Design a protein around this ligand. Sequence first.
Ligand SMILES: [O-][O-]
Ligand SMILES: [Cu+2]
Ligand SMILES: [Cu+2]
Ligand SMILES: [Cu+2]
Ligand SMILES: [Cu+2]
Lengths: 273, 71
Amino acid sequence: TVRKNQATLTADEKRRFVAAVLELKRSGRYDEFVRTHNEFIMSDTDSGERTGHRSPSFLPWHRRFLLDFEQALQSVDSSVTLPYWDWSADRTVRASLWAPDFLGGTGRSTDGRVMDGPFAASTGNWPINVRVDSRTYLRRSLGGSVAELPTRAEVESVLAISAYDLPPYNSASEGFRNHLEGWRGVNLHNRVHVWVGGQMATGVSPNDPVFWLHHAYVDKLWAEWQRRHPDSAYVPTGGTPDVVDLNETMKPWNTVRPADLLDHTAYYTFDAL
Amino acid sequence: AAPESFDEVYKGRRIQGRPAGYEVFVDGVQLHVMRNADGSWISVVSHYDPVPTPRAAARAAVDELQGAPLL
Ligand SMILES: [O-][O-]
Ligand SMILES: [Cu+2]
Ligand SMILES: [Cu+2]
Ligand SMILES: [Cu+2]
Ligand SMILES: [Cu+2]
């Protein structure tokens, strides 16, 4: 129940994480996670109903989504937990994260195809099934579309924002949530998707296993923000059309509310907070 | 007020746009696009990278596709 920095994983932990992810893929369970995410990212809009993105529920939603995935992983290997990627620290293509024994590296220049690691198309173990175009192989272009990943200094500036979110509760909002998501400001979360490229830059981003590590760190940053701002909490707190209020239930689960997900310690802890 | 329609061949591929709130096509296949509160646009092939216009989104898609047909 402890989520660790990907850079600190042992060879066995990396091996077990990879094996668990590959089994979820083989069994067909993995692709359904990709589909769910794509469906919400395609429907969430600034002017209408928004639940998974560009809205206050962006954080609790991805928190629950990751929990669903971690639980599925644990059904294969109970020792496995989601590791997180601190992209402000491990910001180069030579990060152990992109090694052949973990996630594999960047894609070749011709078609962006990842050529090494356990998820390379050549292994026959990672077919891209849920997609927007005909390409069926994992693609990446680390640092191709955007020059740099966020810096610690930039992350600190966002963590310093006191208000969790603010009307109109969408991509135009000031406040922590939108700055962490990245639609406004120095851009943290969105920029990382862009930096990785390939499927990670599209609606079917969970096709790349790094998706979970990226969001696990985004999730950790929410936890860090809570520690810095004990007097700040989730908003809105009632009667907001198209937005998930604190005590309202979230789709697709329908049985959980942001209020049930604010405290992560009920589900897991971090190696260091 | 929705943006104007457009029709051109970009990097060997035909891209079209037309108000509906707005539809975009790459070689006759529709490309799902979305408008942000500030007026910028994103597409299903570039969902976390806002661009100024629907044509910009269409061209970005063609760039990303590298010749691949949209589904
Ligand atoms: O947000 O993926
Ligand atoms: Cu739509
Ligand atoms: Cu998402
Ligand atoms: Cu994301
Ligand atoms: Cu204090």
